[PDB]
Amino acid sequence: SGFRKMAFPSGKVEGCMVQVTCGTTTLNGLWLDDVVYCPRHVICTSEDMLNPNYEDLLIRKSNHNFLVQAGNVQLRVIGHSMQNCVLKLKVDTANPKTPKYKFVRIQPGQTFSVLACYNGSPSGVYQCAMRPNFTIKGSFLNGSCGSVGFNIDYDCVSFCYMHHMELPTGVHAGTDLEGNFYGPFVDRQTAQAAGTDTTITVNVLAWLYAAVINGDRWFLNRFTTTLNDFNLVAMKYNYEPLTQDHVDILGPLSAQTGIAVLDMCASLKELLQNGMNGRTILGSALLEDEFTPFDVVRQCSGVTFQ
Amino acid sequence: SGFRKMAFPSGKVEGCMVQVTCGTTTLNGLWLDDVVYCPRHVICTSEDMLNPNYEDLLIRKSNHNFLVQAGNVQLRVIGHSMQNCVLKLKVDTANPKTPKYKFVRIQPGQTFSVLACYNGSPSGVYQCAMRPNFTIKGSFLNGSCGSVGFNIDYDCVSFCYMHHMELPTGVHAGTDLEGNFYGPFVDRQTAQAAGTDTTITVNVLAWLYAAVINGDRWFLNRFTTTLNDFNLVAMKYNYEPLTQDHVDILGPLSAQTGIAVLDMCASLKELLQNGMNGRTILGSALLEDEFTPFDVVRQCSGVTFQ
Numbered sequence: 040s041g042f043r044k045m046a047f048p049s050g051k052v053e054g055c056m057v058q059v060t061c062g063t064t065t066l067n068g069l070w071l072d073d074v075v076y077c078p079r080h081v082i083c084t085s086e087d088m089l090n091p092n093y094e095d096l097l098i099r100k101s102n103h104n105f106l107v108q109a110g111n112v113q114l115r116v117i118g119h120s121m122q123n124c125v126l127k128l129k130v131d132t133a134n135p136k137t138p139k140y141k142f143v144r145i146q147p148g149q150t151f152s153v154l155a156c157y158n159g160s161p162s163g164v165y166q167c168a169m170r171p172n173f174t175i176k177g178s179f180l181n182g183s184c185g186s187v188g189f190n191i192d193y194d195c196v197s198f199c200y201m202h203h204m205e206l207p208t209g210v211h212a213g214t215d216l217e218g219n220f221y222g223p224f225v226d227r228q229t230a231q232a233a234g235t236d237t238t239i240t241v242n243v244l245a246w247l248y249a250a251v252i253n254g255d256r257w258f259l260n261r262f263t264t265t266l267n268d269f270n271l272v273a274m275k276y277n278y279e280p281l282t283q284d285h286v287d288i289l290g291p292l293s294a295q296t297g298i299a300v301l302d303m304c305a306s307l308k309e310l311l312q313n314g315m316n317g318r319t320i321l322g323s324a325l326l327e328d329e330f331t332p333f334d335v336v337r338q339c340s341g342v343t344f345q
Numbered sequence: 346s347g348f349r350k351m352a353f354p355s356g357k358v359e360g361c362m363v364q365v366t367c368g369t370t371t372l373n374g375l376w377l378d379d380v381v382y383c384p385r386h387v388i389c390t391s392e393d394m395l396n397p398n399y400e401d402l403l404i405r406k407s408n409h410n411f412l413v414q415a416g417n418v419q420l421r422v423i424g425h426s427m428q429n430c431v432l433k434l435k436v437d438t439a440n441p442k443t444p445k446y447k448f449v450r451i452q453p454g455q456t457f458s459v460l461a462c463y464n465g466s467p468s469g470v471y472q473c474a475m476r477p478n479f480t481i482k483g484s485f486l487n488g489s490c491g492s493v494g495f496n497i498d499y500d501c502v503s504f505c506y507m508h509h510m511e512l513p514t515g516v517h518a519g520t521d522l523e524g525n526f527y528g529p530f531v532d533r534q535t536a537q538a539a540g541t542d543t544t545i546t547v548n549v550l551a552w553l554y555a556a557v558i559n560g561d562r563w564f565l566n567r568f569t570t571t572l573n574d575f576n577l578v579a580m581k582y583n584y585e586p587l588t589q590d591h592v593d594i595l596g597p598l599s600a601q602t603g604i605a606v607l608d609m610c611a612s613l614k615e616l617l618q619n620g621m622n623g624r625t626i627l628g629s630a631l632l633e634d635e636f637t638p639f640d641v642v643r644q645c646s647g648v649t650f651q
């Protein structure tokens with residue numbers, strides 16, 4: 040029993056992190072097979088960050104201007120290209136620690152583990168959600184760019200995030216491993232603002248199921264609701280609309296607990312309208328939305344990775 | 346910027362986890378050099394758990410009754426002994442993945458990373474504190490026994506926890522790697538109760554400093570206090586008494602922020618007496634006590650591990 044924000048074991052990703060230096064700028068890269076992936080703003084000076092023309096800046100860069108270091112050892116860069124907002128550095132050595140992996144562009148509401156790195160060295164690991172406004176609430180300092188987010192499915196690492204930047208209110212923006220930003224963000228030091236940070240309703244419901252499974256049941260009430268009536272309350276509280284697909288996805292947790300999804304929505308409705316009256320659920324005084332239904336099943340059934 | 350519950354990268358510990366089976370019971374062991382460490386209740390049946398005589402049960406066990414599996418491969422057990430509440434299985438192969446390591450018995454209020462394992466396979470990683478009542482608030486299911494807690498200091502893994510059992514209210518008890526339980530717990534299925542769960546005051550103060558560093562400053566008030574006057578308020582709210590040693594330990598965060606520890610205590614006093622009025626600090630609606638001063642400095646300065 041117990042329920043914690045749990046990251047995937049990071050060992051398979053630790054063996055892929057390297058340091059990339061171009062001129063004065065050092066950040067992290069991802070070494071898979073004979074390619075290093077890194078944020079393209081590695082080629083920028085601080086001045087350049089204000090209004091960069093990446094194609095123009097890249098003309099002044101050759102293979103030998105990229106220093107790539109795997110622990111204490113330099114890799115030889117034999118080619119480079121820009122794909123959207125990432126550079127791909129072809130190196131003459133395949134990473135012998137390359138795991139089975141895929142590149143995935145995740146949907147908003149999905150979770151992943153971040154391995155925060157500095158100078159190609161892992162600092163720490165934590166769980167994040169892709170928020171509805173396509174930001175993440177990370178912990179990133181200067182030097183953390185190129186840190187990656189991932190999920191593990193038994194043996195296979197699905198890389199879904201590379202860290203590029205921080206927005207006002209200290210939330211974070213980045214790309215998939217094809218270099219396409221999540222949301223409307225650009226890799227320029229220019230005024231950009233996150234939209235409304237809406238709550239991931241289906242994840243809050245998943246977490247309420249986790250609470251029940253752990254014997255935290257005080258919030259289970261005597262009411263039910265409809266999707267349409269529940270969604271009139273969600274709209275007011277900046278909750279994502281709940282759909283039938285969401286109800287389907289909560290099927291395993293609903294079946295395990297014997298609590299109909301719409302009965303759990305009616306419990307959520309009362310928590311939104313009345314607050315928690317100074318009570319806690321799984322040690323939290325707020326409604327948690329960074330656990331997916333899969334995260335709850337995985338933690339409550341003990342799914343492992345090899 | 347941003348502040349998250351952050352685990353150490355787990356790769357160095359993943360390469361030490363094995364599966365130990367004795368009769369019908371399977372749990373996790375820790376393979377360092379030519380020794381496997383595991384909970385001694387691996388030798389018990391369910392019946393035995395009610396009132397076990399471990400010395401007597403062990404007489405019926407030989408080297409060949411312990412099956413130890415590192416991934417897909419069996420290790421040969423050439424010796425066994427019981428040290429307090431752990432078994433030490435001598436195997437004929439030194440783990441080639443053994444990191445630099447130490448065994449440390451941590452103090453209450455200290456934090457560590459848990460790598461939750463099932464059948465010798467890592468499931469996930471998360472941060473925990475040793476609570477004042479010598480419990481941890483983990484996520485552990487049947488099969489998780491032998492999972493370990495650790496800290497990393499650059500290259501060196503300090504193992505401080507091995508998981509043995511769950512108490513009522515779904516908190517967890519275990520041993521150091523010499524097999525001595527933290528607190529008064531025994532490895533018997535008998536009525537045992539946790540004492541009062543007191544709050545780690547110095548850690549709450551460390552987290553308030555983390556909030557300031559991140560620009561969350563609304564709670565900074567106009568008052569100061571004394572250690573003795575602050576401690577009269579802590580006693581009422583089941584906070585640990587703050588000592589001069591604690592004030593010394595908060596020195597780096599106090600110096601970085603320019604906020605005197607006793608001024609931060611006066612802010613904490615007002616939060617304890619008035620509550621948060623529905624406001625949040627680093628996205629929390631409660632006072633967090635599972636970050637040490639070191640955890641805050643480490644996260645806010647980007648300390649890495651190799």
Ligand SMILES: *[C@](O)(C(N)=O)[C@H](C[C@@H]1CCNC1=O)NC(=O)[C@@H]1[C@@H]2[C@H](CN1C(=O)[C@@H](NC(=O)CC(C)(C)C)C(C)(C)C)C2(C)C
Nearest residue numbers: 080179181182183184203204205206207226227228229231
């Ligand atoms: C990254 O390059 C690195 N070396 O780690 C760096 C990571 C930042 C630093 C603080 N927290 C982080 O996550 N990323 C950057 O410095 C990117 C880079 C240029 C600026 N930038 C930023 O993240 C800016 N933010 C903005 O410009 C957006 C704004 C103005 C709306 C806040 C800040 C000011 C450094 C945070 C580019 C190419 C985007």
Ligand SMILES: *[C@](O)(C(N)=O)[C@H](C[C@@H]1CCNC1=O)NC(=O)[C@@H]1[C@@H]2[C@H](CN1C(=O)[C@@H](NC(=O)CC(C)(C)C)C(C)(C)C)C2(C)C
Nearest residue numbers: 386485487488489490509510511512513532533534535537
């Ligand atoms: C461990 O052996 C394993 N195979 O993973 C197991 C882990 C538990 C299961 C549920 N959550 C966990 O952390 N540990 C045990 O089963 C230990 C073991 C015998 C009983 N036990 C327990 O943890 C008991 N708890 C108690 O007996 C204490 C009590 C009665 C005060 C609650 C429970 C009932 C299974 C949780 C021994 C030797 C302690």
